[PDB]
Amino acid sequence: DDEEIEKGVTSIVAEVTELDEKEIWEKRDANFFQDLEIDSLLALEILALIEKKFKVQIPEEKLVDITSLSATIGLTKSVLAESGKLEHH
Ligand SMILES: [Zn+2]
Ligand SMILES: [Zn+2]
Ligand SMILES: [Zn+2]
Ligand SMILES: [Zn+2]
Ligand SMILES: [Zn+2]
Ligand SMILES: [Zn+2]
Ligand SMILES: [Zn+2]
């Protein structure tokens, strides 16, 4: 589910980053690194929490490209479509 995925990924990134869900969403196209924090440890943690929410295996080596909220959402959608679990409109 499109809404469900975009909101779930937002919540996870908000947690890991200790930022507010509305701000992270407003900054959905910001670069994850430098432009506000998020390093390889935080990206690693984002990946792991997504691989718990949605029950989804993500070979854990994209973090270099877990690079914005919208990129991260897109990654989650791709992986959900691989798994036969995406309803996309
Ligand atoms: Zn619905
Ligand atoms: Zn949307
Ligand atoms: Zn803290
Ligand atoms: Zn708040
Ligand atoms: Zn966008
Ligand atoms: Zn660090
Ligand atoms: Zn896995």
Structure tokens at 7: 């909101």
The bound ligand whose nearest atom lies closest to the alpha carbon of 9 is 2
Distance (Å) from CA 19 to ligand 4 centroid = 7
Q: To what resolution in angstroms was this structure determined?
A: 1.8
Q: How many CB atoms lie within 10 A of CB 25?
A: 16
Residues flanking ion ligand 2, Cβ below 5 Å: 6
CA atoms within 13 A on the CB side of 9: 22
Quote the CA–CA distance of 9 and 73 in Å, as a whole number.
Answer: 6
* Alpha-carbon gap, residue 83 to 15, rounded angstroms: 25
Q: Report the distance separating Cα 75 and Cα 87, nearest Å.
A: 15
The length of the chain in residues reads 89
Single-letter amino acid, residue 31: N
Q: Would the annotation count 37 as a binding residue?
A: no
Residue recorded with tokens 């937002």: 10
Q: In 3-state terms, what secondary structure has residue 74?
A: helix
